Design a protein around this motif. Structure first.
Motif, mmCIF file in Angstrom:
data_model
loop_
_atom_site.group_PDB
_atom_site.id
_atom_site.type_symbol
_atom_site.label_atom_id
_atom_site.label_comp_id
_atom_site.label_asym_id
_atom_site.label_seq_id
_atom_site.Cartn_x
_atom_site.Cartn_y
_atom_site.Cartn_z
ATOM 1 N N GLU D 15 0.828 -1.204 0.000
ATOM 2 C CA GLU D 15 0.000 0.000 0.000
ATOM 3 C C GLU D 15 0.863 1.255 0.000
ATOM 4 O O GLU D 15 0.669 2.137 -0.833
ATOM 5 C CB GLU D 15 -0.922 0.025 1.221
ATOM 6 C CG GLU D 15 -2.181 -0.820 1.107
ATOM 7 C CD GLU D 15 -3.132 -0.614 2.281
ATOM 8 O OE1 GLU D 15 -2.652 -0.393 3.415
ATOM 9 O OE2 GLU D 15 -4.364 -0.674 2.071
ATOM 10 N N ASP D 16 1.813 1.317 0.937
ATOM 11 C CA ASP D 16 2.718 2.464 1.100
ATOM 12 C C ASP D 16 3.465 2.813 -0.184
ATOM 13 O O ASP D 16 3.672 3.987 -0.489
ATOM 14 C CB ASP D 16 3.732 2.207 2.226
ATOM 15 C CG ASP D 16 3.106 2.253 3.620
ATOM 16 O OD1 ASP D 16 2.046 2.893 3.794
ATOM 17 O OD2 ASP D 16 3.687 1.655 4.553
ATOM 18 N N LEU D 17 3.858 1.784 -0.928
ATOM 19 C CA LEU D 17 4.586 1.952 -2.180
ATOM 20 C C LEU D 17 3.655 2.316 -3.338
ATOM 21 O O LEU D 17 4.005 3.131 -4.191
ATOM 22 C CB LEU D 17 5.364 0.673 -2.502
ATOM 23 C CG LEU D 17 6.517 0.742 -3.504
ATOM 24 C CD1 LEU D 17 7.674 1.587 -2.982
ATOM 25 C CD2 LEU D 17 6.986 -0.665 -3.818
ATOM 26 N N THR D 18 2.473 1.707 -3.355
ATOM 27 C CA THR D 18 1.473 1.955 -4.395
ATOM 28 C C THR D 18 1.055 3.430 -4.433
ATOM 29 O O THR D 18 1.011 4.032 -5.507
ATOM 30 C CB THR D 18 0.239 1.029 -4.222
ATOM 31 O OG1 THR D 18 0.671 -0.335 -4.186
ATOM 32 C CG2 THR D 18 -0.739 1.193 -5.367
ATOM 33 N N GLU D 19 0.772 4.002 -3.261
ATOM 34 C CA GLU D 19 0.370 5.405 -3.141
ATOM 35 C C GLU D 19 1.488 6.339 -3.584
ATOM 36 O O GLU D 19 1.240 7.337 -4.266
ATOM 37 C CB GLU D 19 -0.023 5.745 -1.700
ATOM 38 C CG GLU D 19 -1.232 4.994 -1.172
ATOM 39 C CD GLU D 19 -1.370 5.106 0.336
ATOM 40 N N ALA D 20 2.714 6.003 -3.185
ATOM 41 C CA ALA D 20 3.897 6.812 -3.481
ATOM 42 C C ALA D 20 4.089 7.015 -4.979
ATOM 43 O O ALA D 20 4.498 8.089 -5.420
ATOM 44 C CB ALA D 20 5.141 6.189 -2.863
ATOM 45 N N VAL D 21 3.790 5.974 -5.750
ATOM 46 C CA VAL D 21 3.851 6.035 -7.204
ATOM 47 C C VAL D 21 2.662 6.835 -7.752
ATOM 48 O O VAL D 21 2.826 7.661 -8.654
ATOM 49 C CB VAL D 21 3.906 4.616 -7.824
ATOM 50 C CG1 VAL D 21 4.016 4.686 -9.335
ATOM 51 C CG2 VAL D 21 5.083 3.834 -7.258
ATOM 52 N N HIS D 22 1.475 6.602 -7.189
ATOM 53 C CA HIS D 22 0.261 7.314 -7.602
ATOM 54 C C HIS D 22 0.313 8.814 -7.298
ATOM 55 O O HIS D 22 -0.499 9.586 -7.814
ATOM 56 C CB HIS D 22 -0.993 6.680 -6.985
ATOM 57 C CG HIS D 22 -1.376 5.370 -7.605
ATOM 58 N ND1 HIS D 22 -1.700 4.259 -6.855
ATOM 59 C CD2 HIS D 22 -1.482 4.992 -8.901
ATOM 60 C CE1 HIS D 22 -1.996 3.256 -7.663
ATOM 61 N NE2 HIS D 22 -1.868 3.673 -8.909
ATOM 62 N N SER D 23 1.271 9.212 -6.463
ATOM 63 C CA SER D 23 1.524 10.618 -6.169
ATOM 64 C C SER D 23 2.473 11.226 -7.201
ATOM 65 O O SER D 23 2.404 12.423 -7.485
ATOM 66 C CB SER D 23 2.103 10.776 -4.763
ATOM 67 N N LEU D 24 3.355 10.393 -7.754
ATOM 68 C CA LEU D 24 4.301 10.816 -8.790
ATOM 69 C C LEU D 24 3.625 11.055 -10.139
ATOM 70 O O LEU D 24 4.146 11.790 -10.980
ATOM 71 C CB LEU D 24 5.418 9.781 -8.963
ATOM 72 C CG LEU D 24 6.428 9.534 -7.840
ATOM 73 C CD1 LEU D 24 7.429 8.488 -8.288
ATOM 74 C CD2 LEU D 24 7.144 10.811 -7.414
ATOM 75 N N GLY D 25 2.470 10.425 -10.335
ATOM 76 C CA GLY D 25 1.733 10.518 -11.588
ATOM 77 C C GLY D 25 2.020 9.339 -12.494
ATOM 78 O O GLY D 25 2.348 9.515 -13.668
ATOM 79 N N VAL D 26 1.909 8.135 -11.945
ATOM 80 C CA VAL D 26 2.061 6.913 -12.728
ATOM 81 C C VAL D 26 0.962 5.917 -12.367
ATOM 82 O O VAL D 26 1.068 5.180 -11.383
ATOM 83 C CB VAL D 26 3.459 6.283 -12.551
ATOM 84 N N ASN D 27 -0.100 5.920 -13.170
ATOM 85 C CA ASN D 27 -1.258 5.059 -12.950
ATOM 86 C C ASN D 27 -1.271 3.828 -13.865
ATOM 87 O O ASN D 27 -2.331 3.407 -14.339
ATOM 88 C CB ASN D 27 -2.554 5.866 -13.094
ATOM 89 N N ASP D 28 -0.088 3.257 -14.100
ATOM 90 C CA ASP D 28 0.057 2.055 -14.931
ATOM 91 C C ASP D 28 1.037 1.029 -14.336
ATOM 92 O O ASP D 28 1.912 0.505 -15.036
ATOM 93 C CB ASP D 28 0.458 2.430 -16.368
ATOM 94 C CG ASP D 28 1.872 2.979 -16.460
ATOM 95 O OD1 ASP D 28 2.643 2.489 -17.310
ATOM 96 O OD2 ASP D 28 2.212 3.887 -15.672
ATOM 97 N N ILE D 29 0.879 0.746 -13.045
ATOM 98 C CA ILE D 29 1.684 -0.275 -12.368
ATOM 99 C C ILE D 29 1.106 -1.669 -12.615
ATOM 100 O O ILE D 29 -0.110 -1.868 -12.546
ATOM 101 C CB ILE D 29 1.784 -0.017 -10.850
ATOM 102 N N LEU D 30 1.986 -2.626 -12.907
ATOM 103 C CA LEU D 30 1.580 -4.001 -13.197
ATOM 104 C C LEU D 30 1.486 -4.844 -11.923
ATOM 105 O O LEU D 30 0.388 -5.201 -11.490
ATOM 106 C CB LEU D 30 2.528 -4.648 -14.215
#
Lengths: 197, 79, 195, 78
Positions: D15-30
């Motif tokens: 969760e902690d890592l998922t949000e961190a990316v979604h804050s950077l502006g990357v909504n395409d994590i596999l």
RNA sequence: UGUAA
């Protein structure tokens, strides 16, 4: 289903008090006094408390450290006749009880294990082997519920550590058969990991 | 003085052995040490037994293998 | 503080019934179904029961065997929404239920452990690791109090062993980490050995 | 397309890592795969994330500049 | 886990 509240380590303040020394100076003398007392009072009755806190939503067990490699739970041998729960509370206050005038009550309710020592030797087991009729020591473990905030006093010789469950798990060479088998026994409880503030 | 009693079941106790010895007339029991599986505490099925008499040693070596302990006759050996 | 009544193994008759094959044949087949079900239903909820007897003044744990190598407890998967205790009685009767017609009511009362599975892999632990927020499987263990006498029916693909605690204690290569860790958890009970 | 993320604490969750990316502006994590100790289940301190090329260069550029649990992440190609 | 305490 048993619901236990856990609080972060920082909720608790750890003071200091005068050193406490064991009745025995060596491992050989420890079994010596055991042999002598077995002919006097019979089987030894021991109790120990499992104080549980948490860090980062993971259960931690408070252990007393003696040096670099030896860990133990707070407790000790009961005086003859003494009730197991009352004796533990006494033994707790002696080891971890605060030094000022305010009372610190111990919430000791749940038994988590029984360990028997078949001979005047190191091995312990969570059962009595079928050929043993006179065990030499009977240990008893209770879960101690800590309140939201508490003050403790640790004897100068000892040091207090919060051991995470994964550190104990499958690590008998590290902590011994009893302490290292704690995670399994502790899993029946439903812990709430309360945060600071 | 010292004898190995073997072929014991793992649920043969020290009481069981003491009761069988005393029933043979041997009172001179000095010690009973069970040999056990350190990992789990189970009896390996044999014990070392100290007696005080050559008459007790003789009775134990002759009459003990005759009787049955929990469905098993013991095997007595010198040492 | 907790009194549990145990009875001799000879108090219990064990019979047979028609085979009940597992939902998947392989090890690879069972981890794929777990992966497929997880996306649709989420975490798998498994409950298992510990039936205790005694022989030679020592508690024995009834286990089921498939190979000469694999042992398990009676139990299995809960259907989504199903209560923990209610579902165990279903699975218990499915595995060990008599074909007699006679009523065999299961007394499940005490939780003895909880086991979590972080990934779609063999490893299971008695806690949720700090970095896991959605485990894939949660296995719950319950103690089952038996009647003084009972008749069970074992599926033919299974065989029933009464394993003493010492054969289990410290023996993970022989029984896995869950069955082998039973003695410790079980030690908190005051067992009466009725003769 | 694969990316190694290190210097994480053992209590840094998915969760902690998922949000961190979604804050950077990357909504395409596999998929996020943590590297964990088999004996006890503890996180070793790093993971591998499946990712677009725009979303990859971004995360290698921008992620270490956002701390998690008082620690800065370290990024590396597969 | 045993005085390296």
């Amino acid at each position: 289903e048993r619901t236990i509240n856990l609080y972060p380590l920082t909720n608790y303040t750890f003071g200091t008090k005068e050193p406490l020394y064991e009745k025995d100076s060596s491992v050989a003398a420890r079994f010596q006094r055991m042999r002598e007392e077995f002919d006097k009072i019979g089987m030894r009755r021991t109790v120990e408390g499992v104080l549980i806190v948490h860090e980062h939503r993971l259960p931690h067990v408070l252990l007393l450290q003696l040096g670099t490699t030896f860990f133990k739970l707070p407790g000790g041998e009961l005086n003859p006749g003494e009730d197991e729960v009352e004796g533990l509370k006494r033994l707790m206050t002696e080891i971890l009880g605060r030094q000022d005038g305010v009372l610190q009550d111990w919430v000791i309710d749940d038994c988590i294990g029984n360990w028997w020592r078949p001979n005047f030797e190191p091995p312990q087991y969570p059962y009595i082997p079928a050929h043993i009729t006179k065990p030499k020591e009977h240990k008893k473990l209770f879960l101690v519920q800590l309140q939201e905030k508490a003050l403790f006093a640790v004897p100068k010789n000892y040091k207090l550590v919060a051991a995470p469950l994964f550190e104990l798990y499958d690590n008998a060479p590290g902590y011994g058969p009893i302490i290292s088998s704690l995670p399994q026994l502790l899993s029946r409880f439903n812990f709430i990991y309360n945060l600071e503030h | 003085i010292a004898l190995y009693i073997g072929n014991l079941t793992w649920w043969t106790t020290d009481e069981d052995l003491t009761e069988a010895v005393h029933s043979l007339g041997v009172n001179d029991i000095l010690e009973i040490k069970f040999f056990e599986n350190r990992a789990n505490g189970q009896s390996k099925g044999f014990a070392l037994v100290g007696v005080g008499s050559e008459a007790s040693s003789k009775k134990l070596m002759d009459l003990l293998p005759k009787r049955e302990l929990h469905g098993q006759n013991p095997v007595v050996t010198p040492s």
